[PDB]
Motif scaffolding. Structure first.
Motif, PDB file in Angstrom:
ATOM      1  N   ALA A 189      55.280  61.460  16.269  1.00  7.90           N
ATOM      2  CA  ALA A 189      55.987  61.920  17.460  1.00  7.90           C
ATOM      3  C   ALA A 189      55.127  61.684  18.698  1.00  7.90           C
ATOM      4  N   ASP A 190      55.689  60.973  19.675  1.00  6.65           N
ATOM      5  CA  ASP A 190      55.171  60.680  21.017  1.00  6.65           C
ATOM      6  C   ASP A 190      54.198  59.501  20.992  1.00  6.65           C
ATOM      7  N   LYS A 191      53.917  58.922  19.822  1.00  5.34           N
ATOM      8  CA  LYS A 191      52.954  57.825  19.749  1.00  5.34           C
ATOM      9  C   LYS A 191      53.418  56.635  20.579  1.00  5.34           C
ATOM     10  N   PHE A 192      54.727  56.375  20.580  1.00  2.00           N
ATOM     11  CA  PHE A 192      55.278  55.234  21.303  1.00  2.00           C
ATOM     12  C   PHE A 192      55.059  55.366  22.805  1.00  2.00           C
ATOM     13  N   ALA A 193      55.388  56.532  23.367  1.00  2.00           N
ATOM     14  CA  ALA A 193      55.304  56.713  24.813  1.00  2.00           C
ATOM     15  C   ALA A 193      53.875  56.561  25.317  1.00  2.00           C
ATOM     16  N   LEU A 194      52.901  57.086  24.573  1.00  2.00           N
ATOM     17  CA  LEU A 194      51.510  56.933  24.985  1.00  2.00           C
ATOM     18  C   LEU A 194      51.062  55.479  24.906  1.00  2.00           C
ATOM     19  N   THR A 195      51.403  54.785  23.816  1.00  2.00           N
ATOM     20  CA  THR A 195      50.947  53.408  23.653  1.00  2.00           C
ATOM     21  C   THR A 195      51.554  52.496  24.712  1.00  2.00           C
ATOM     22  N   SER A 196      52.811  52.744  25.088  1.00  2.00           N
ATOM     23  CA  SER A 196      53.450  51.909  26.099  1.00  2.00           C
ATOM     24  C   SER A 196      52.883  52.202  27.482  1.00  2.00           C
ATOM     25  N   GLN A 197      52.680  53.484  27.799  1.00  2.00           N
ATOM     26  CA  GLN A 197      52.056  53.852  29.066  1.00  2.00           C
ATOM     27  C   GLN A 197      50.667  53.243  29.194  1.00  2.00           C
ATOM     28  N   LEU A 198      49.867  53.316  28.127  1.00  2.00           N
ATOM     29  CA  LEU A 198      48.529  52.736  28.166  1.00  2.00           C
ATOM     30  C   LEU A 198      48.579  51.218  28.295  1.00  2.00           C
ATOM     31  N   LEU A 199      49.543  50.569  27.632  1.00  2.00           N
ATOM     32  CA  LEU A 199      49.665  49.118  27.748  1.00  2.00           C
ATOM     33  C   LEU A 199      50.065  48.700  29.156  1.00  2.00           C
ATOM     34  N   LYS A 200      50.962  49.459  29.788  1.00  2.00           N
ATOM     35  CA  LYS A 200      51.288  49.200  31.186  1.00  2.00           C
ATOM     36  C   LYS A 200      50.049  49.315  32.063  1.00  2.00           C
ATOM     37  N   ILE A 201      49.174  50.272  31.755  1.00  2.00           N
ATOM     38  CA  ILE A 201      47.977  50.475  32.560  1.00  2.00           C
ATOM     39  C   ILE A 201      46.973  49.344  32.353  1.00  2.00           C
ATOM     40  N   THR A 202      46.803  48.887  31.111  1.00  2.00           N
ATOM     41  CA  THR A 202      45.704  47.989  30.769  1.00  2.00           C
ATOM     42  C   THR A 202      46.091  46.517  30.751  1.00  2.00           C
ATOM     43  N   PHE A 203      47.355  46.184  30.984  1.00  2.00           N
ATOM     44  CA  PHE A 203      47.744  44.777  31.002  1.00  2.00           C
ATOM     45  C   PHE A 203      47.155  43.965  32.158  1.00  2.00           C
ATOM     46  N   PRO A 204      47.099  44.481  33.417  1.00  2.00           N
ATOM     47  CA  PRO A 204      46.464  43.695  34.493  1.00  2.00           C
ATOM     48  C   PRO A 204      45.074  43.173  34.153  1.00  2.00           C
ATOM     49  N   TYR A 205      44.440  43.754  33.129  1.00  2.00           N
ATOM     50  CA  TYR A 205      43.060  43.408  32.805  1.00  2.00           C
ATOM     51  C   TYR A 205      42.896  41.929  32.467  1.00  2.00           C
ATOM     52  N   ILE A 206      43.932  41.281  31.924  1.00  2.00           N
ATOM     53  CA  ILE A 206      43.805  39.862  31.591  1.00  2.00           C
ATOM     54  C   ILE A 206      43.785  39.017  32.854  1.00  2.00           C
ATOM     55  N   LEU A 207      44.650  39.330  33.821  1.00  2.00           N
ATOM     56  CA  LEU A 207      44.606  38.607  35.084  1.00  2.00           C
ATOM     57  C   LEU A 207      43.253  38.799  35.750  1.00  2.00           C
ATOM     58  N   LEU A 208      42.628  39.958  35.531  1.00  2.00           N
ATOM     59  CA  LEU A 208      41.286  40.201  36.044  1.00  2.00           C
ATOM     60  C   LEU A 208      40.242  39.399  35.273  1.00  2.00           C
ATOM     61  N   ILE A 209      40.304  39.433  33.939  1.00  2.00           N
ATOM     62  CA  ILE A 209      39.184  38.934  33.145  1.00  2.00           C
ATOM     63  C   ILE A 209      39.241  37.415  33.001  1.00  2.00           C
ATOM     64  N   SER A 210      40.435  36.822  33.056  1.00  2.00           N
ATOM     65  CA  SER A 210      40.523  35.367  33.019  1.00  2.00           C
ATOM     66  C   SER A 210      39.965  34.753  34.296  1.00  2.00           C
ATOM     67  N   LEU A 211      40.245  35.369  35.446  1.00  2.00           N
ATOM     68  CA  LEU A 211      39.630  34.919  36.689  1.00  2.00           C
ATOM     69  C   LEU A 211      38.120  35.114  36.647  1.00  2.00           C
ATOM     70  N   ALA A 212      37.669  36.268  36.146  1.00  2.00           N
ATOM     71  CA  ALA A 212      36.237  36.515  36.001  1.00  2.00           C
ATOM     72  C   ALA A 212      35.588  35.492  35.077  1.00  2.00           C
ATOM     73  N   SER A 213      36.271  35.136  33.987  1.00  2.00           N
ATOM     74  CA  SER A 213      35.759  34.106  33.088  1.00  2.00           C
ATOM     75  C   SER A 213      35.620  32.771  33.807  1.00  2.00           C
ATOM     76  N   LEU A 214      36.654  32.368  34.549  1.00  2.00           N
ATOM     77  CA  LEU A 214      36.587  31.143  35.339  1.00  2.00           C
ATOM     78  C   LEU A 214      35.370  31.146  36.260  1.00  2.00           C
ATOM     79  N   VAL A 215      35.247  32.185  37.092  1.00  2.00           N
ATOM     80  CA  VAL A 215      34.089  32.302  37.978  1.00  2.00           C
ATOM     81  C   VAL A 215      32.796  32.273  37.171  1.00  2.00           C
ATOM     82  N   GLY A 216      32.806  32.893  35.987  1.00  2.00           N
ATOM     83  CA  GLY A 216      31.640  32.833  35.118  1.00  2.00           C
ATOM     84  C   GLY A 216      31.242  31.411  34.779  1.00  2.00           C
ATOM     85  N   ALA A 217      32.219  30.592  34.377  1.00  2.00           N
ATOM     86  CA  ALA A 217      31.918  29.220  33.984  1.00  2.00           C
ATOM     87  C   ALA A 217      31.374  28.420  35.160  1.00  2.00           C
TER      88      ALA A 217
END
Length: 608
Positions: A222-250
């Motif tokens: 019970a409630d596992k879905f709502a937390l996982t979806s809320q957290l995924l909404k929060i943590t998804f921008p991280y790829i747009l952040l980390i792929s750019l950071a990786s590029l700058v890294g290279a």
């Protein structure tokens, strides 16, 4: 060899300081001159990639040029009978050795990543997260949410762009002149930012469907879905952040110091630990902090490397306007790569699918055991990637099989010698490690016991993974061999069948032991394809060597069990005392392993 010439010069130095006659001094200074000249010829480990005429090699040789000039002054002094002044010049040679040449003996793999400080910080983050709220349903939600974008960064950031961006940037840097590379990077970064924005927006919007397809079992709780979806909404921008950071890294890797891009993981670590301590009381539920901690960390990783980019004149003004012209030169490389890259992620998705239908904490137990294993995997990885891998690179580029074969056989010996102990040693000290590092409030003994049952299972993959690290370069070195993809597809089918078999009896440890056995199967298929293609023929004498290694590993295992039986409970005392009992047992087992080796007809000479 550069190391041979280096120990030569060092030995000769200590001989000069303890000398009595002008003959004994002139001789040593003479040999040092010759050896310095000859040492000027090696491509130092920090520059293995670099060409023998680039200004990096030029700087290396200039340091040695100063060395030989000083030795010439010292030979003149010794020819005039000035024993003391010759010795003085000798003792001042070390200043040049430390200033100009010492920054070139660091390993490419070591400079590239994983300083001990950052490693300790990552362990502190995992221990801190566990202690405040680890091993619950909340951490299950967060760990799922966290791994989901970490799959997508593999197709955008590290995998396909290392296939495509890394060589094309060098081409532009040399053949096309400096100024065109600016515009090149402008449009590449632009189209990357755009496609990443599409991905993150769609993923945030359709996050519930994403969780269904990824980890559907949570609706049982019970409630596992709502937390996982809320957290995924929060943590998804991280790829747009980390792929750019990786590029700058290279980019920052190509031009300037390799170390500044390596620091960036520490920012995720720092963000997480401080956010967990000082923000978890503020958010209800509290796991949200973690999720924000991720994204808050991501921004920093990017914004940390931008200023240094300005100095090398590479600060991007990402232009998105070349949809057709700018894309293709790099998107063609991506097209062939995306098959091998995407298939690999599909399997790890399916593994989280399997893990969804288990008990609350299965994912978190698996993740903490994975976090423990990461440390020896990285350590063994980088050690083997400085000793053996560069030499194999050379012996493939120039010479034919014979040398390459003898090298690869020595390396396959080294793989077992360093991994098989570490694997079984972590098997033994699994209990001690999980309790000492993770036993704190909200992490019960049961959580450490399940994490221990997963660490046992993950241990097997250590040896297979490092053997894969050795064997994959041999295929990638052949310009157009694209079999690893077939081997990977076979490995993933086999992995899913092993999970099917292993989930019933072994619970989450089954899904973990399947990954452990799958790494060994990947290595075994690469080996059978390396010896059925006639690329390499194994050297003779393994049977005796393997039996010797069996005996030495059995010795170390025996010492570890004996010491553990003596030891007090791994719950007694605070974290420092638990970890100082662990250091006792660890150092003892390690020293015992080397002792066994030395007694078992093995070398002890160590250099570098």
């Amino acid at each position: 060899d550069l190391e041979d010439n280096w120990e030569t010069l060092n030995d000769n130095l200590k001989v000069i300081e303890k000398a009595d006659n002008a003959a004994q001094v002139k001789d040593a200074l003479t040999k040092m001159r010759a050896a310095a000249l000859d040492a000027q010829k090696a491509t130092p480990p920090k520059l293995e990639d670099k060409s023998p005429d680039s200004p990096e090699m030029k700087d290396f040789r200039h340091g040695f040029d100063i060395l030989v000039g000083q030795i010439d002054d010292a030979l003149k002094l010794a020819n005039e009978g000035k024993v003391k002044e010759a010795q003085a010049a000798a003792e001042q040679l070390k200043t040049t050795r430390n200033a100009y040449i010492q920054k070139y003996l660091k390993s490419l793999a070591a400079v590239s990543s994983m300083t001990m400080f950052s490693r300790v910080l990552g362990f502190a983050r995992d221990a801190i997260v566990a202690r405040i709220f680890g091993a619950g349903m909340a951490t299950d939600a967060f760990f799922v949410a966290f791994k989901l974008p970490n799959l997508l960064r593999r197709i955008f950031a590290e995998g396909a762009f290392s296939q495509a961006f890394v060589p094309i940037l060098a081409e532009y840097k040399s053949k096309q002149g400096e100024d065109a590379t600016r515009v090149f990077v402008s449009y590449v970064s632009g189209l990357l930012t755009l496609a990443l924005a599409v991905v993150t927006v769609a993923g945030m919007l359709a996050a519930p469907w994403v969780i269904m397809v990824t980890a559907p079992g949570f609706a049982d709780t019970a409630d596992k879905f709502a937390l996982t979806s809320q957290l995924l909404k929060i943590t998804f921008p991280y790829i747009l952040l980390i792929s750019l950071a990786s590029l700058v890294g290279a980019i920052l890797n190509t031009w300037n110091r390799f170390s500044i891009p390596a620091f960036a993981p520490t920012l995720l670590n720092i963000s997480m630990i401080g956010f967990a301590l000082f923000a978890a009381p503020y958010f209800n539920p509290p796991v949200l902090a973690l999720a924000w901690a991720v994204t808050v960390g991501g921004v920093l990783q990017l914004v940390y490397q931008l200023p240094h980019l300005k100095k090398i004149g590479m600060l991007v003004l990402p232009r998105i306007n070349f949809h057709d012209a700018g894309a293709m030169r790099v998107v063609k490389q991506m097209g062939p790569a995306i098959l091998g890259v995407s298939v690999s992620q599909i399997s790890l998705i399916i593994n989280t699918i399997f893990a969804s239908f288990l008990a609350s904490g299965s994912v978190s137990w698996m993740y903490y055991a994975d976090r423990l294993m990461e440390f020896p995997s990285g350590v063994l990885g980088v050690a083997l990637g400085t000793i053996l891998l560069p030499s194999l690179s050379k012996s493939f580029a120039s010479g034919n099989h014979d040398e390459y074969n003898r090298l690869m056989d020595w390396g396959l010996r080294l793989c077992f010698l360093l991994a098989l102990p570490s694997a079984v040693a972590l098997g033994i000290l699994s209990g001690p490690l999980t309790v000492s590092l993770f036993q704190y409030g909200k992490f019960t003994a049961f959580d450490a016991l399940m994490t221990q049952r997963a660490l046992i299972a993950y241990s097997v993959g250590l040896i297979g993974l490092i053997v894969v690290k050795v064997l994959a370069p041999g295929f990638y070195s052949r310009q157009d061999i694209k079999t690893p993809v077939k081997i990977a597809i076979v490995t993933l089918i086999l992995t899913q069948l092993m999970n099917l078999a292993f989930i019933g009896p072994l619970k989450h440890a089954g899904l973990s032991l399947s990954i452990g056995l799958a790494a060994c199967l990947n290595a075994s298929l690469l080996y059978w394809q390396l010896r059925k293609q006639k690329i390499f023929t194994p050297q003779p004498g393994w049977m005796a060597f393997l039996l010797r290694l069996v005996v030495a590993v059995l010795v170390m295992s025996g010492v570890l069990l004996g010491m553990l039986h003596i030891m007090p409970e791994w719950s007694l005392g605070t974290m420092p005392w638990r970890l100082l009992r662990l250091m006792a047992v660890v150092l003892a087992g390690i020293a015992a392993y080397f002792a066994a080796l030395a007694v078992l007809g093995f070398k002890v000479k160590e250099f570098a």
